[PDB]
Ligand binder design. Structure first.
Ligand code: FE
Lengths: 177, 49, 59, 118
């Protein structure tokens, strides 16, 4: 463009460059900011905020994974799983599967001692097919036998009229995860 | 040429934050965390007579 | 250098200040806005805009 | 990152690979935070006279995290396949680690092939 650096001659013969006063409406190609979208660009979104939100989503997912891994204890204690005993929960809470624990017991003193534990696992894919129909679990013992028959489904389990005969053992805890 | 960014890759060098595989039965490498967790609890032999 | 208001002699014998017509590149320290960066800044991201993306990643 | 986290939890980290009778005195320990789902134990056939770990007739057992918390340092008996009933294995299990018992030495025909965590 044709830009002229206007100046003035001082009475000594020296030269002095000067800037004339102007208005924003006079300048061409100004492309001004209306002071309103400036605050809009101020609000927007920063890199740090997005990084924090993404890390929050990531650690929320990690917390979900930890919670589904640790699971919820449906029942804890001691039970013979005789006729009429049954546990029920919610299907949506069932995420990966179910774990069951058994231990020693005596019908004489009714004291569930803590040793000789046996564990059994049943995944969700195992449980959907096993809806209603039960499973047979044989736990270690000096002599063969002492089994438990359990109608384990994807929403509830029950007992049977055989587990009372094998009263030397008892279910300890059932958990979903 | 131009503006060149050089890290440990183009020189085929180990990173500052690099770790080696844990030693196996036939391999030599780092000592595992649970190996030390087993070692420290292991009581030192008792010196009597 | 000095900043000057420069006025002409109006025929009633007065001094009227007048702003000369200039251009964007003629003024120093204008801080240019390219009229393309404005659209880019308008697009960018809202504070709530980068929230459903994180929620979708979590889901 | 979430996918990598869940996959790394799923694949697990081996705690011990090798072979041993897992008798009285032997034990394994680890940081509790490494446990997210549970522990898995793999056993195999063994030779008492030759002391070489034959590779067949494996047997696997899985303990969950909730069962692990309930069984803090408590006993678990795992039977294993055999031509005749017996040769059980007794272990003391916990969320932090496991130990052994002086009965696994009697049944030298089988050994704990490996133990993994996940
Ligand atoms: Fe190194």
């Amino acid at each position: 463009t044709k830009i002229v650096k206007m100046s003035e001659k001082n009475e000594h013969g020296t030269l002095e460059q000067f800037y004339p006063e102007t208005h924003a409406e006079a300048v061409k190609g100004l492309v001004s900011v209306s002071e309103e979208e400036k605050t809009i660009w101020d609000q927007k979104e920063s890199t740090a905020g997005a990084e924090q939100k993404a890390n929050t989503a990531l650690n929320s997912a990690k917390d979900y994974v930890d919670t589904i891994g640790e699971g919820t204890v449906i029942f804890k204690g001691a039970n013979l799983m005789g006729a009429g005993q049954s546990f029920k929960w919610d299907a949506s809470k069932l995420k990966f599967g179910m774990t069951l624990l058994f231990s020693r017991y005596d019908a004489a003193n009714n004291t569930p001692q803590d040793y000789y534990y046996h564990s059994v696992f049943l995944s969700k894919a195992q449980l959907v097919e096993l809806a209603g129909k039960g499973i047979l679990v044989q736990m270690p013992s000096t002599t063969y036998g002492d089994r438990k028959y359990l109608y384990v489904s994807t929403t509830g389990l029950s007992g049977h009229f055989d587990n009372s005969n094998y009263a030397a053992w008892a279910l300890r805890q059932v958990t979903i995860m | 040429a131009g503006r060149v960014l050089l890290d440990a890759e183009d020189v085929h060098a180990a990173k500052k934050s690099h770790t080696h595989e844990v030693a196996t039965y036939t391999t030599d490498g780092f000592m595992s965390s649970f190996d030390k967790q087993k070692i420290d609890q292991l009581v030192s032999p008792e010196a009597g007579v």
